[PDB]
C-alpha cells in the first residue's frame with residue numbers, strides 16, 4: 389500500500405531514491421485513493437500495480453514513453469502504460485494504433501498480444517503522466533496530485549549521467565517537455581495514438597526507429613523493440 393509503506397518497499401532501489409522528493413506526495417496519493425473508495429468510486433489499475441513502472445531499474449532506463457493516464461476499462465490497465473495482460477483481446481484502440489505504427493516503422497509482424505513487458509525489461513519506461521483513473525472515465529484523476537510524482541520521475545531521469553530519449557504521446561505527456569531540457573536528453577513529441585488524435589501526426593511518426601537513431605548518436609545501445 390502506497391499509504392502504508394515507504395518507497396524503499398514499494399519501488400526499485402534507484403527509483404526509491406529518485407522519488408525521495410515526492411515521498412510524502414506518494415503517501416498523499418494513497419490517501420486520495422482511500423478517500424475515493426470511501427466515497428464509492430473505484431480506481432485503476434489495481435493498487436499493487438499503480439507504481440509498477442518504478443519496479444524496473446531506474447539506472448537501466450534508456451527510453452521513456454509517456455501517455456496520459458491508465459486504460460479506463462476494468463481488466464486493461466496493468467501499471468505499465470499502454471500494456472495489457474497477454475490474454476486481453478480485442479486490444480484497446482490506442483494499442484492497436486501503436487502496433488500499426490510499430491509494423492510500419494520497424495517492418496516487424498504484428499505482435500501476438502498486447503503485453504509490453506519485454507520493452508520494460510529492456511530499458512523502456514512505460515509511464516503515464518497520471519497513474520490512476522476512475523473506471524470508464526478517462527482523465528478523471530487529472531490534477532489530483534500525480535503530476536508532481538511523474539514530474540519528479542522525469543527530472544530525476546534527466547539528471548542521470550546517462551543518455552535518455554523521451555517519447556511524449558499527447559498533450560498531458562507534453563507538459564514534461566520543459567523538464568527534459570538538459571543535453572543528455574532528447575524528446576520526440578507527437579499526438580497521442582488514440583483514435584481521437586492519431587491522424588494528426590501519430591501515424592507516420594516512426595518513434596521507435598527515431599529513438600534508436602537518437603540513442604546510437606549519444607553512444608548508447610538501441611532498444612530491441614521486437615515483440616513476440
Ligand SMILES: Nc1c[nH]c(=O)[nH]c1=O
Nearest residue numbers: 455456457458459469470
Ligand atoms: N490512452 C491511454 C491508454 N492507456 C495508457 O496506459 N495510457 C494512455 O494514455
Ligand SMILES: [Cl-]
Nearest residue numbers: 429430522523
Ligand atoms: Cl467507480
Ligand SMILES: [Cl-]
Nearest residue numbers: 427428429430
Ligand atoms: Cl460518486
